[PDB]
Amino acid sequence: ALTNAQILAVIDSWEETVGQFPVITHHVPLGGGLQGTLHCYEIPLAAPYGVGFAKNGPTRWQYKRTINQVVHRWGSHTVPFLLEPDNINGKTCTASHLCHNTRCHNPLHLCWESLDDNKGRNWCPGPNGGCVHAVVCLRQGPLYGPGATVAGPQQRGSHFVV
Amino acid sequence: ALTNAQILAVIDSWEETVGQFPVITHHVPLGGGLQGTLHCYEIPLAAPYGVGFAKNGPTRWQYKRTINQVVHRWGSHTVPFLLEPDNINGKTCTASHLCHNTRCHNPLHLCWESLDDNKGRNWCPGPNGGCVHAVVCLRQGPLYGPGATVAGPQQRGSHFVV
DNA sequence: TTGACTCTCTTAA
DNA sequence: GAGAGTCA
DNA sequence: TTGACTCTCTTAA
DNA sequence: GAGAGTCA
Ligand SMILES: [Mn+2]
Ligand SMILES: [Mn+2]
Ligand SMILES: [Zn+2]
Ligand SMILES: [Zn+2]
Ligand SMILES: [Zn+2]
Ligand SMILES: [Zn+2]
């Protein structure tokens, strides 16, 4: 809610509940031929999810609390960042998974950044493969690699130059 | 159904028309601190665009030809690839700008690949900065860099480990 | 047959 | 990646 | 008050 | 990144 005290209380309640979510170990590519280990705190697949949590989409959840007799609700991954600016350079800040695991609610796996920065982590070579993200990636992005392009640049005639 | 010859005729008329678009010289980052030059063949900002072309959205156009009394229409950047497979790994192929300039219709600046491959080029370090795309990028992606993350991973208590 | 507009849709964060 | 409503 | 569902929306390719 | 309709 409005007060800093009320916001800290929301973060603390969220952390306590999420801290009881099952811890699932995931081994992940780091780039550079190296592998690391992440510990994701994963929300259950089906109800009940935990005090204050409810599913609004197959991979979307919301956290809700009643403060001053009013219900307040947030996207389930946005709660760690309730004291942060909600925009940057005129772009909305999003919760962004460094582990690329939507069910995970480990705040040590989340950052707060534009949707473009968020998306771009999908292709990052990773913390041992050349990641240049200022807030460093925890793993190589799942879509990093040569791609599967079907056809490259081409012309039939002689009208074009690169 | 249009024959191969008819499709080739469509590609040829498209190239003839696009080759007469204004050619704009752009200096671009290649990665590795190097700069290069790309020559984009840019569709006009407003009608008329060129024979067969019409705008269906702010940054969307279509190419239309009538053959044996039947109207055929294609996305304006898909025409170079009409003789190519239209899906790969169960994913639809998309026209993908290597120059990241939607107005450009230079077929030497286009490739044909999944939407994920397409998007990921936005963050590529570029052909002189470590590009691993099998069909190589022509330039560093416009969104490459450290990003502007507002808040990093953090916890208030001690409930979590990375 | 052609131009110049109109509308809505896909994907995965 | 999001917000908000309907029921019990 | 809390839980478990429902729906549609945003963005930029 | 897409497909399709209307009107003259
Ligand atoms: Mn993400
Ligand atoms: Mn693109
Ligand atoms: Zn995680
Ligand atoms: Zn990174
Ligand atoms: Zn171009
Ligand atoms: Zn590349």
Side-chain angles (χ1 to χ4, degrees), chain A residues 56 60 62 73 75 95 97 118:
Chain A
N56 48 315
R60 311 281 324 155
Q62 290 168 297
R73 189 159 45 168
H97 274 86
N118 184 329

Short mmCIF file of all heavy atoms in Angstrom, two decimals, chain A residues 56 60 62 73 75 95 97 118, chain D:
data_model
loop_
_atom_site.label_atom_id
_atom_site.label_comp_id
_atom_site.label_asym_id
_atom_site.label_seq_id
_atom_site.Cartn_x
_atom_site.Cartn_y
_atom_site.Cartn_z
N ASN A 56 -3.61 -16.24 -12.53
CA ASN A 56 -4.48 -15.51 -13.49
C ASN A 56 -4.20 -15.98 -14.93
O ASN A 56 -4.90 -15.53 -15.84
CB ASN A 56 -4.32 -14.00 -13.37
CG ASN A 56 -2.89 -13.49 -13.34
OD1 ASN A 56 -2.05 -14.05 -12.65
ND2 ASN A 56 -2.63 -12.42 -14.07
N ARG A 60 1.11 -17.09 -15.24
CA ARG A 60 0.95 -15.77 -14.59
C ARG A 60 0.27 -15.92 -13.24
O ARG A 60 -0.72 -16.66 -13.14
CB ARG A 60 0.16 -14.77 -15.45
CG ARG A 60 0.60 -14.67 -16.90
CD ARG A 60 1.85 -13.83 -17.10
NE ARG A 60 1.92 -12.69 -16.20
CZ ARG A 60 3.04 -12.09 -15.83
NH1 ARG A 60 4.20 -12.52 -16.29
NH2 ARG A 60 3.01 -11.06 -15.01
N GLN A 62 -0.66 -13.63 -9.32
CA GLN A 62 -0.77 -12.31 -8.68
C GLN A 62 -0.69 -12.50 -7.16
O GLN A 62 -1.15 -13.54 -6.68
CB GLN A 62 -2.08 -11.63 -9.07
CG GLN A 62 -2.18 -11.17 -10.51
CD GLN A 62 -3.60 -10.78 -10.84
OE1 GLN A 62 -4.51 -11.60 -10.79
NE2 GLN A 62 -3.80 -9.51 -11.15
N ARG A 73 -3.27 -5.59 -5.07
CA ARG A 73 -2.85 -6.74 -5.86
C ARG A 73 -1.73 -6.36 -6.81
O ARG A 73 -1.74 -5.28 -7.40
CB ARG A 73 -4.03 -7.32 -6.65
CG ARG A 73 -3.72 -8.64 -7.31
CD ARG A 73 -4.97 -9.43 -7.65
NE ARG A 73 -6.03 -8.65 -8.27
CZ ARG A 73 -7.10 -9.19 -8.84
NH1 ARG A 73 -7.26 -10.50 -8.91
NH2 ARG A 73 -8.05 -8.39 -9.34
N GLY A 75 1.35 -8.12 -9.78
CA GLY A 75 1.93 -9.27 -10.46
C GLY A 75 2.89 -9.99 -9.52
O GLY A 75 3.64 -9.33 -8.79
N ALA A 95 9.38 -7.16 -14.13
CA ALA A 95 10.10 -8.25 -13.49
C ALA A 95 10.68 -9.13 -14.59
O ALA A 95 10.00 -9.45 -15.57
CB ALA A 95 9.16 -9.04 -12.59
N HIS A 97 13.18 -12.55 -15.30
CA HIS A 97 13.78 -13.77 -14.76
C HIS A 97 15.19 -13.99 -15.31
O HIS A 97 15.37 -14.24 -16.51
CB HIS A 97 12.92 -14.97 -15.11
CG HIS A 97 11.81 -15.22 -14.14
ND1 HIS A 97 10.59 -14.59 -14.25
CD2 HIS A 97 11.73 -16.03 -13.07
CE1 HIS A 97 9.80 -15.00 -13.27
NE2 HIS A 97 10.47 -15.88 -12.54
N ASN A 118 14.78 -7.27 -20.73
CA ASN A 118 14.22 -8.56 -20.37
C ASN A 118 14.30 -9.55 -21.53
O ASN A 118 14.96 -10.59 -21.44
CB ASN A 118 12.77 -8.31 -19.92
CG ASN A 118 12.07 -9.55 -19.40
OD1 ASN A 118 12.34 -10.68 -19.84
ND2 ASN A 118 11.14 -9.35 -18.47
P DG D 1 9.88 -12.82 -17.33
OP1 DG D 1 9.30 -13.97 -18.09
OP2 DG D 1 9.53 -12.84 -15.87
"O5'" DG D 1 9.16 -11.51 -17.91
"C5'" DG D 1 7.81 -11.23 -17.48
"C4'" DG D 1 7.36 -9.94 -18.12
"O4'" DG D 1 6.88 -10.22 -19.45
"C3'" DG D 1 6.22 -9.24 -17.41
"O3'" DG D 1 6.80 -8.42 -16.40
"C2'" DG D 1 5.60 -8.44 -18.55
"C1'" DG D 1 5.76 -9.38 -19.73
N9 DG D 1 4.60 -10.24 -19.96
C8 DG D 1 4.54 -11.61 -19.92
N7 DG D 1 3.34 -12.07 -20.17
C5 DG D 1 2.57 -10.94 -20.39
C6 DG D 1 1.19 -10.82 -20.71
O6 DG D 1 0.37 -11.73 -20.87
N1 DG D 1 0.81 -9.49 -20.85
C2 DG D 1 1.64 -8.41 -20.70
N2 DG D 1 1.09 -7.20 -20.88
N3 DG D 1 2.94 -8.52 -20.40
C4 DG D 1 3.33 -9.80 -20.27
P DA D 2 5.85 -8.24 -15.13
OP1 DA D 2 6.47 -7.24 -14.19
OP2 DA D 2 5.48 -9.55 -14.52
"O5'" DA D 2 4.56 -7.59 -15.80
"C5'" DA D 2 3.34 -7.53 -15.05
"C4'" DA D 2 2.39 -6.60 -15.77
"O4'" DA D 2 2.14 -7.12 -17.10
"C3'" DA D 2 1.03 -6.45 -15.11
"O3'" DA D 2 1.10 -5.39 -14.19
"C2'" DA D 2 0.14 -6.13 -16.31
"C1'" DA D 2 0.76 -6.99 -17.40
N9 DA D 2 0.20 -8.34 -17.49
C8 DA D 2 0.83 -9.53 -17.27
N7 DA D 2 0.05 -10.57 -17.43
C5 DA D 2 -1.17 -10.03 -17.79
C6 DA D 2 -2.41 -10.62 -18.10
N6 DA D 2 -2.63 -11.93 -18.10
N1 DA D 2 -3.43 -9.79 -18.42
C2 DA D 2 -3.21 -8.47 -18.42
N3 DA D 2 -2.09 -7.81 -18.14
C4 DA D 2 -1.10 -8.65 -17.83
P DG D 3 0.20 -5.40 -12.88
OP1 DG D 3 0.74 -4.33 -12.02
OP2 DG D 3 0.09 -6.80 -12.38
"O5'" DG D 3 -1.23 -4.99 -13.42
"C5'" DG D 3 -1.38 -3.76 -14.10
"C4'" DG D 3 -2.80 -3.60 -14.57
"O4'" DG D 3 -3.11 -4.70 -15.46
"C3'" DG D 3 -3.81 -3.64 -13.43
"O3'" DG D 3 -4.63 -2.52 -13.41
"C2'" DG D 3 -4.64 -4.89 -13.67
"C1'" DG D 3 -4.31 -5.31 -15.09
N9 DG D 3 -4.16 -6.75 -15.11
C8 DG D 3 -3.15 -7.47 -14.51
N7 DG D 3 -3.33 -8.76 -14.60
C5 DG D 3 -4.55 -8.89 -15.26
C6 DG D 3 -5.26 -10.05 -15.64
O6 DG D 3 -4.96 -11.22 -15.46
N1 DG D 3 -6.46 -9.74 -16.29
C2 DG D 3 -6.90 -8.46 -16.54
N2 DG D 3 -8.08 -8.35 -17.18
N3 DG D 3 -6.24 -7.37 -16.19
C4 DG D 3 -5.08 -7.66 -15.56
P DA D 4 -5.61 -2.29 -12.16
OP1 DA D 4 -6.01 -0.87 -12.22
OP2 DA D 4 -4.97 -2.86 -10.96
"O5'" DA D 4 -6.87 -3.25 -12.45
"C5'" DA D 4 -7.69 -2.99 -13.56
"C4'" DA D 4 -8.76 -4.06 -13.70
"O4'" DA D 4 -8.11 -5.34 -13.95
"C3'" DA D 4 -9.66 -4.27 -12.46
"O3'" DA D 4 -11.02 -4.05 -12.80
"C2'" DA D 4 -9.43 -5.72 -12.10
"C1'" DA D 4 -8.93 -6.32 -13.41
N9 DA D 4 -8.17 -7.52 -13.14
C8 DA D 4 -6.99 -7.61 -12.44
N7 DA D 4 -6.58 -8.84 -12.25
C5 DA D 4 -7.56 -9.61 -12.85
C6 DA D 4 -7.72 -11.00 -13.00
N6 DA D 4 -6.84 -11.89 -12.52
N1 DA D 4 -8.82 -11.44 -13.64
C2 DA D 4 -9.69 -10.54 -14.11
N3 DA D 4 -9.66 -9.22 -14.02
C4 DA D 4 -8.56 -8.81 -13.38
P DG D 5 -12.19 -4.18 -11.69
OP1 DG D 5 -13.08 -3.03 -11.93
OP2 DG D 5 -11.63 -4.41 -10.35
"O5'" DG D 5 -12.93 -5.53 -12.11
"C5'" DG D 5 -13.54 -5.62 -13.37
"C4'" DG D 5 -14.28 -6.94 -13.51
"O4'" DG D 5 -13.32 -8.04 -13.45
"C3'" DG D 5 -15.32 -7.22 -12.43
"O3'" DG D 5 -16.46 -7.83 -13.01
"C2'" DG D 5 -14.61 -8.18 -11.49
"C1'" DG D 5 -13.70 -8.95 -12.44
N9 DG D 5 -12.49 -9.44 -11.78
C8 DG D 5 -11.50 -8.69 -11.20
N7 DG D 5 -10.54 -9.40 -10.67
C5 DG D 5 -10.92 -10.71 -10.91
C6 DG D 5 -10.28 -11.92 -10.58
O6 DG D 5 -9.22 -12.08 -9.98
N1 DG D 5 -11.02 -13.03 -11.01
C2 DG D 5 -12.21 -12.97 -11.69
N2 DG D 5 -12.77 -14.14 -12.03
N3 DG D 5 -12.82 -11.83 -12.02
C4 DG D 5 -12.12 -10.75 -11.60
P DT D 6 -17.74 -8.21 -12.12
OP1 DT D 6 -18.92 -8.04 -13.01
OP2 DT D 6 -17.64 -7.57 -10.79
"O5'" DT D 6 -17.55 -9.76 -11.87
"C5'" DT D 6 -17.44 -10.62 -12.99
"C4'" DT D 6 -17.53 -12.06 -12.55
"O4'" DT D 6 -16.33 -12.44 -11.85
"C3'" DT D 6 -18.68 -12.39 -11.60
"O3'" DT D 6 -19.13 -13.66 -12.01
"C2'" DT D 6 -18.00 -12.42 -10.22
"C1'" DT D 6 -16.65 -13.01 -10.59
N1 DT D 6 -15.50 -12.69 -9.70
C2 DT D 6 -14.70 -13.72 -9.28
O2 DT D 6 -14.97 -14.88 -9.49
N3 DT D 6 -13.61 -13.35 -8.55
C4 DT D 6 -13.21 -12.06 -8.25
O4 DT D 6 -12.21 -11.82 -7.58
C5 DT D 6 -14.06 -11.02 -8.75
C7 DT D 6 -13.72 -9.59 -8.45
C6 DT D 6 -15.14 -11.37 -9.47
P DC D 7 -20.65 -14.14 -11.83
OP1 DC D 7 -21.05 -14.68 -13.14
OP2 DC D 7 -21.47 -13.08 -11.22
"O5'" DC D 7 -20.53 -15.35 -10.85
"C5'" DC D 7 -20.56 -15.14 -9.49
"C4'" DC D 7 -19.61 -16.09 -8.80
"O4'" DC D 7 -18.39 -15.39 -8.49
"C3'" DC D 7 -20.14 -16.66 -7.49
"O3'" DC D 7 -20.17 -18.06 -7.56
"C2'" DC D 7 -19.14 -16.18 -6.44
"C1'" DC D 7 -17.91 -15.90 -7.28
N1 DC D 7 -17.00 -14.91 -6.70
C2 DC D 7 -15.85 -15.36 -6.07
O2 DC D 7 -15.68 -16.58 -5.96
N3 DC D 7 -15.00 -14.45 -5.52
C4 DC D 7 -15.25 -13.15 -5.64
N4 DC D 7 -14.37 -12.29 -5.11
C5 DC D 7 -16.41 -12.66 -6.32
C6 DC D 7 -17.24 -13.57 -6.84
P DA D 8 -21.24 -18.86 -6.67
OP1 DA D 8 -21.50 -20.11 -7.42
OP2 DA D 8 -22.34 -17.95 -6.30
"O5'" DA D 8 -20.43 -19.28 -5.35
"C5'" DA D 8 -19.31 -20.16 -5.43
"C4'" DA D 8 -18.52 -20.15 -4.14
"O4'" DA D 8 -17.74 -18.93 -4.04
"C3'" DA D 8 -19.38 -20.21 -2.86
"O3'" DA D 8 -19.01 -21.34 -2.09
"C2'" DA D 8 -19.06 -18.89 -2.13
"C1'" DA D 8 -17.68 -18.57 -2.69
N9 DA D 8 -17.29 -17.16 -2.60
C8 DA D 8 -18.02 -16.07 -2.97
N7 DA D 8 -17.42 -14.92 -2.76
C5 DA D 8 -16.21 -15.29 -2.17
C6 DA D 8 -15.11 -14.54 -1.69
N6 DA D 8 -15.06 -13.19 -1.73
N1 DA D 8 -14.07 -15.22 -1.16
C2 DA D 8 -14.13 -16.56 -1.12
N3 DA D 8 -15.10 -17.37 -1.54
C4 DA D 8 -16.12 -16.67 -2.07
#
